C-alpha cells in the first residue's frame, strides 16, 4: 500500500505544531525542502514532517532556537555516524586479531 503524501504549508504546520513563520525559517535553514523551492506554492513530502517532529522534540528538550537546533541535529548525526564507524573498526580489529 505504497503512497506519496504531500502537505501544503498550512497542512504541515497543523501536523507538526510549528507556525508558518517558523516553517519558513526551518526551510531557510535547510532543514527540509519543498518539492520546488522557487515555485509559487511550496509543497512538502511527508518525509519532511518526520524531520520537523524530530526538531520540535529537540527544541523542547534543549530549548534552542531553530538555527541552534539545525546545528545540534547535524552534530548529533555526525557523532552517531562516527560512533558506528568506530564500532566497525573495533570489530574489524578483533576479526583481524582472531585471524592472526
Amino acid at each position: 500500500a505504497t503512497v506519496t503524501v504531500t502537505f501544503t504549508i498550512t497542512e504541515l504546520c497543523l501536523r507538526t505544531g510549528v507556525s508558518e513563520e517558523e516553517l519558513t525559517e526551518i526551510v531557510g535553514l535547510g532543514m527540509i525542502e519543498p518539492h520546488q523551492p522557487q515555485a509559487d506554492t511550496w509543497l512538502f513530502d511527508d518525509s519532511a514532517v518526520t524531520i520537523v517532529h524530530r526538531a520540535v522534540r529537540l527544541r523542547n528538550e534543549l530549548e534552542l532556537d531553530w538555527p541552534g537546533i539545525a546545528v545540534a541535529l547535524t552534530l548529533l548525526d555526525e557523532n552517531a555516524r562516527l560512533t558506528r564507524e568506530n564500532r566497525l573498526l573495533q570489530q574489524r580489529l578483533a576479526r583481524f586479531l582472531a585471524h592472526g
Partner: protein, 74 residues
Amino acid sequence: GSELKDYYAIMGVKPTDDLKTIKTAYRRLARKYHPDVSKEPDAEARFKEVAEAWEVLSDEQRRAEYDQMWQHRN
C-alpha cells in the same frame, strides 16, 4: 585590476531579500560547509566565499555600495 563576485548567487538569495533572509542563508551555508560535519569535497573553499559574501551583505552600508556597483557593471 580587481575582483567583484556575485554575492547574492553565492548565498542563494535574491538581491531584494532582507537581512533576516540573508542571515538565514548564511546559517544554512555555514552548517553545510562547517569543517567538522561537511560532506562537501570543496567545503573550505566554498565556506571562504560564503563568508566573504556575508561580510558584505550583513553591513547595510557595504551592501548599498555593492548593489550600486553590481547593478551598473559593463
